[PDB]
Amino acid sequence: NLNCMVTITTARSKYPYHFFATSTGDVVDISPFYNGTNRNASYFGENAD
Amino acid sequence: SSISTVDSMIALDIDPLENTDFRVLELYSQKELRSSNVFDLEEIMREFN
Ligand SMILES: *[C@@H]1O[C@H](CO)[C@@H](O[C@@H]2O[C@H](CO)[C@@H](O[C@@H]3O[C@H](CO)[C@@H](O)[C@H](O)[C@@H]3O)[C@H](O)[C@H]2NC(C)=O)[C@H](O)[C@H]1NC(C)=O
Ligand SMILES: *[C@@H]1O[C@H](CO)[C@@H](O[C@@H]2O[C@H](CO)[C@@H](O)[C@H](O)[C@H]2NC(C)=O)[C@H](O)[C@H]1NC(C)=O
């Protein structure tokens, strides 16, 4: 049985905003404000591919 | 009684120190203290449940 889902949760990040954390424990090492042209001023450490 | 008098008293009226009811100052409310965390334990446990 195959079921696809779309969960919409809330994630929180603290200053310096170098990682956020959804309510389900998805710790992501990406700055919530990294727009792809400001890597020098915002962290990004997850998989590049 | 118009010959006048002499006010030889040297005034030393020292005002009493006024009373001060100190406030119980609160910088951050409990809501902000609970919301100042990347991870909340209650949310994690509720999602696990
Ligand atoms: C991705 O986000 C970065 C910041 O993390 C953006 O860089 C910043 O973009 C703003 C908006 O254009 C720039 O402000 C501009 O500055 C000049 C004065 O120098 C003025 O002419 C404009 O009115 C405007 O306010 C800002 O300088 C720039 N850099 C920094 C370090 O903040 C970037 O634009 C974002 N990229 C995308 C594609 O959204
Ligand atoms: C990338 O960011 C770093 C710090 O996040 C910037 O380094 C600063 O550069 C300014 C101007 O040269 C210095 O006054 C600061 O002392 C530097 N800080 C640190 C921590 O090194 C760097 O300039 C940024 N690169 C850009 C915007 O191209």
Curated annotation (Swiss-Prot), chain A:
Report the PTM annotation.
A proteolytic cleavage by host furin generates two subunits that remain linked by disulfide bonds.
**Record: glycosylation sites:** 35, 40
Q: Origin, by domain of life?
A: Viruses
Where located?
Answer: Virion membrane; Host cell membrane; Host endosome membrane; Host Golgi apparatus membrane
Quaternary assembly: Homotrimer; disulfide-linked. Binds to heparan sulfate proteoglycans. Interacts with gH/gL heterodimer. Interacts with host C-type lectin CD209/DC-SIGN. Interacts with host ITGB1, EGFR, and PDGFRA.
Q: What does this protein do?
A: Envelope glycoprotein that plays a role in host cell entry, cell to-cell virus transmission, and fusion of infected cells. May be involved in the initial attachment via binding to heparan sulfate together with the gM/gN complex that binds heparin with higher affinity. Interacts with host integrin ITGB1, PDGFRA and EGFR that likely serve as postattachment entry receptors. Also participates in the fusion of viral and cellular membranes leading to virus entry into the host cell. Membrane fusion is mediated by the fusion machinery composed at least of gB and the heterodimer gH/gL.
Q: Which family does it belong to?
A: Belongs to the herpesviridae glycoprotein B family.
- Protein's name in the database: Envelope glycoprotein B
Q: What is the covered span of the full protein?
A: 247 to 295 of 907
